Amino acid sequence: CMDILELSERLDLQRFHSHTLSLYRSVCALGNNRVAHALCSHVDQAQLLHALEDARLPGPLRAGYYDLLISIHLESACRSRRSMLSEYIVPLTPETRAITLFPPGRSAEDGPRRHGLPGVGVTTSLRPPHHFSPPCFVVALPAAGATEAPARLSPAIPLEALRDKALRMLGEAVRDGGQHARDPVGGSVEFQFVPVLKLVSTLLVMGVFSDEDVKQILKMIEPEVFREELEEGLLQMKLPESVKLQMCHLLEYFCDQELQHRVESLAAFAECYVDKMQGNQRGRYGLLMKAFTMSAAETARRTREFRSPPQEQINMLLHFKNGADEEECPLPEEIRQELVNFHQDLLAHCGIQLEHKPQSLQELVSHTVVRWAQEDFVQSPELVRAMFSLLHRQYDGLGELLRALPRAYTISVSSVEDTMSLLECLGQIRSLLIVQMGPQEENLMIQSIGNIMNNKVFYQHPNLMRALGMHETVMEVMVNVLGGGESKEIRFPKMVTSCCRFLCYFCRISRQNQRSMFDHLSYLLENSGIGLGMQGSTPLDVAAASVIDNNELALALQEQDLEKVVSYLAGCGLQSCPMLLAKGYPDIGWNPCGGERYLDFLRFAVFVNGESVEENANVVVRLLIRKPECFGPALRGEGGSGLLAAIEEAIRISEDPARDGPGVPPEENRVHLGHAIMSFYAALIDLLGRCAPETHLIQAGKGEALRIRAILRSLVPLDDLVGIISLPLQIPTLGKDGALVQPKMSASFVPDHKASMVLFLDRVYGIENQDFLLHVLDVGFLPDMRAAASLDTATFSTTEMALALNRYLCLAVLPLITKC
């Protein structure tokens, strides 16, 4: 062994060891807390702190060890906190109530001219705490199975001592820079300053510094501007460009703190003001009710306000900025004046309301940035971007608050615990955005989604969820997993299914959630090209949920999305399923399963709330006829056998093995080709029937409606529908010494297939002739009704076929007979 300080002259060893530190950082990078714990055994806390304080260390090794400390102990917590820091969930507590824009004083009417010290004082925005684990290597290893144990926490290091050492080191660096010695720590001013500033910025963002520490940091940055009640601050020290970049990071943190303070002050004021407004409105309503109809017109005039929704009531009560009379805005003047005064205070704080010394953070940042740009032609593009972002914020503080407010949200004290749990789960999900999906990551994602869906705040505050962007994060993770190596197959089907189920529930929760997910329909349809590998929820299911039973969104649907889905359906009708071919299924020449999925989406697109959407239905019908392969080989013009012949051939396929399955049941007894073909044709007939025009349009005699009905009748003959409706169904029977012989629903002709035929017959052809009604009753309906009645015994009443027959009758047949 040698002294590590010999690496100042042993340059090859120095380079190799610095790259070794880089490799340590890489192996623990981006949230690998297990590897960080492992590295704690190779570079212990004593070594890290000694290297931090060592002044003889070569610059590369000094920077490497500072970065290694940050990577092992602080990087994950800093990243999670930084992700959380852009949102303002303000609980309505006494601490929030006490928050004011300007500190109590008398310097000026619009609050004292002097701001409070940035980053100092009470802040109530919700931020989940930091979680660390001791680095011990004598504990018993988790006996639990692999990937089932909880995610590892980052190794712990004493944060109080670390922050004290960081502050002392920054002070010493400032003093040395003032002294202008010829042997800077690390061999250069950059190597002396940049690591210390990186550590200080990391600790600041994690928020471990106390108020006194923040005051010391502010004094080091600028002794005079941040004087409370070295003679030269860091900002005037003639530093390199990288040091200036670290300074820009510090200033960015403090500007973010000022913006957060503004948001919290606005929320605190809003609580009191809405309280006052609600009390005043209650009093006004009481007085109006006590009034004994002085005038009916006046009473209706006044009561319209209470008839209006609360948001409109708020808008009306606040619409007095430019002045209004008591008739327009009932709000009293003594209450209007409070809002006017607060608006003046907010403008003054943002600087929008109006020496060679700055005297404020905004002025200091503006002056510093402009002075740097005037003094030098800055060469670092990152530095230039940082300076000009800071300058823009300083000049447009009000626009900054305007853009930040969409991410602000107030909650009651009772929801704080659940919101914190939800925030922790969302932090885990967000952390999963920067790592390739694996088994452990999939388990963590599924657990986080489950916890979020169990959280009650998820249901009560859909606006909060949308502001947090939970749906976008989940969708991004799902799409990453899907896109990664999509060619071979879909990996982590459980993860994809969990994400899709979560997104469907998100759509169902609220109508604004549905619109927000609808905005991403093209993205979902783009990524839904590959499916059926999950066997559960899919991005196509998410897309359907984003439009289901919403007339506004259905009308907002795009012809381009419709053509994309129709092209997917055409591809399915032309090509076989590679997954089935790999599993060993016979090659039938097309893909009924995917075809059925796309047909289901189209059905939800065209049918809304029990009525056909003409705009979507006409487009879909035109696309389908323009690509005839979407109808399947049976409805093919040149050599199509026909719908009835196709269904009969599918029944034969189902009866015959080696034509229905691989014939060399992990999931729903694999897939059966005969049932798949029947299901595809049933879905197509159902979609066409739902595309059929409405009776009122037909009576009005719209040419478009009549033409569409004629096209549908051309596509599907009536005799084929009657034949399919007449096809016999397998009925449970008792045999083999009382054994129950039951048909396999997932591999046979079922009443759900006849339900689609009945729907098409009712909507397109209709029943208007008594002879036809009697004929269809005699051939198709009565036998099925008799079978359902006969299955009403104690043995067969609850069988799958019996229940399916009951559903078929009650949803398709009996309503039709009632109508006729």
């Binding site: 590897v35 055994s41 004598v138 290893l141």
Partner: protein, 107 residues
């Protein structure tokens, strides 16, 4: 396994009992002398409760054998240590461990 060799004597009277919290200062080395863990580096004594299976079997038995105020060397075979699985990234598979353990106090 576990073999205990005294380095400095304890009081010789008080020994850890089941359910008692032992506070220790330890340094861990592989059988070939490579150090992999040490509580003295973190400057914080390590506390564990006997009978809760919080530590490896070799530790559980050796510290029980030790006495308050005693310094000892524990040689722990693989089976009493992390064994075949090891501690990925720290301890190789089938590794004998050597620990220098001082039992500071019992609580």
């Amino acid at each position: 396994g576990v073999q205990v060799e005294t380095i400095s004597p304890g009081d010789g009277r008080t020994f850890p009992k089941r359910g008692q919290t032992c506070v220790v200062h330890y340094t861990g080395m592989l059988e070939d002398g490579k150090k992999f863990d040490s509580s003295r580096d973190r400057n914080k004594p390590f506390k564990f409760t006997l009978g809760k299976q919080e530590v490896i079997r070799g530790w559980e038995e050796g510290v029980a054998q030790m006495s308050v105020g005693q310094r000892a060397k524990l040689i722990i075979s693989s089976d009493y240590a992390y064994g075949a699985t090891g501690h990925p990234g720290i301890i190789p598979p089938h590794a004998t461990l050597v620990f220098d353990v001082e039992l500071l106090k019992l609580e």
